């Protein structure tokens, strides 16, 4: 199944914050409608912030989150959780290597915001 | 019922991130073995990063995050989700205000670490 | 913070279902629009569906569940949950007492349907 | 990342109820440390419940669902969500075909029971 696309609402603030844990130097990718919108890039095996961010979903809502290590691809595992019907999250983790702990790039979306 | 309480892995290392958006300036509380453990403080409707931290879970596993405005506290509502059955996030959101959007201060919890 | 209420697509049909377990007498009201759409009730410590139907999540597409046990309204836990992008959990427990096992009436509400 | 597969907690009571949403008639398998412990087959469009059953984690706390179609193993995707630190969800979504709404039979896994 495909892994780390959302649906937001559209036009809508959000935040996109990315943690690192892995020796692999971490680089994630926003896309907002298919056009990356930011990225960040860094490395830690102690859960470092790597990148935080607020971005607009823009006129069709869709956000895509990739992670690659050195140009391969990370495999992805996300889902979006609703609190009391008002406060989202979009989560992600990635496996760049073998042992699938699936924490190697960890990115958190919320909103709204404000 | 009650919100805010987790159970982690005993003696594990978990990351603890906040984020704020309101007028109110924040403060958050983390509680290991119901002794504080982290607090952060800020005010943004933004979504600023006003603290992260690592932090171990201990011999209990307990973990509890509680936050207030004013020195008044939030109501808070929380989950945990599991993917892959291995990647957790203890969710946290809060309310110092009458709009309900629960965002005031947004708490994550990741595990595991490394 | 309220729960048991859920924003669902308008015109939308989804599944409702209830579980039973507890010593008590469990009636589930599910409110389209806050009116009530359906009544489950049943009595079970094992688990038992008391009632499953499809409904229509109309214009608004508000959906709420509310229960009863002993004359009295259960406290509420409840969230919703996306996998892929497309499949939608609206999850619902329920205490009628004193252990907190927040099981006594449990009701999941999926969408889309077909 | 695998889906499907859930660890219990050991020798504990759990719920499993399926539902089918596909014009292809769905089988599905339950393992409990990797022997099936329950089977459910049918067609629906209206999200009937193709079966509903309490099992016994045993001493693994190994569940896995499978979904197939007259033998045709279905992609899966899945989460545990949990409330109140205690009420568990085990969640999946199956698809059939090429549409992807991961409805075609959705699976529901809970606990405590009781
Ligand atoms: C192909 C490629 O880039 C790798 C990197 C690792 C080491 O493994 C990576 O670092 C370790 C310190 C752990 O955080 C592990 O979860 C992570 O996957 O294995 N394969
Ligand atoms: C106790 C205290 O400091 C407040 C501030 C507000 C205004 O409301 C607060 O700020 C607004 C800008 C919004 O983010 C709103 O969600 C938040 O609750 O109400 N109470
Ligand atoms: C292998 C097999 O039997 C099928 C049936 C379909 C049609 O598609 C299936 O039925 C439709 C009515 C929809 O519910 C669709 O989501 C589902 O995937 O595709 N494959
Ligand atoms: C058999 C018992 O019945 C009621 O007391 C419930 O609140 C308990 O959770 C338990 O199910
Ligand atoms: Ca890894
Ligand atoms: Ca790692
Ligand atoms: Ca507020
Ligand atoms: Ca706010
Ligand atoms: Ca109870
Ligand atoms: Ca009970
Ligand atoms: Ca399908
Ligand atoms: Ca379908």
Redesign the interface.
């Known amino acids: 199944?495909?892994?780390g696309?959302?649906?937001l609402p559209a036009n809508t603030?959000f935040?996109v914050?990315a943690?690192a844990?892995s020796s692999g130097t971490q680089t994630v990718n926003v896309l907002v409608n298919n056009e990356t919108a930011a990225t960040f890039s860094g490395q830690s095996?102690?859960?470092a912030?790597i990148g935080?961010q607020?971005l607009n979903s823009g006129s069709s809502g869709k956000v895509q989150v990739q992670v690659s290590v050195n140009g391969r691809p990370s495999?992805?595992?996300?889902?979006?959780?609703?609190?009391?019907?008002?406060?989202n999250?979009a989560?992600v983790?990635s496996?760049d290597g073998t042992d699938?702990?699936?924490?190697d790039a960890?990115v958190?979306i919320?909103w709204?915001?404000?």
């Open positions: 199944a495909t892994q696309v959302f649906t603030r935040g914050t943690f844990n095996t102690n859960n912030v935080t607020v495999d992805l595992v996300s889902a979006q959780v609703i609190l009391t019907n008002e406060l999250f989560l983790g496996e699938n702990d699936y924490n960890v958190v919320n709204p915001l404000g």
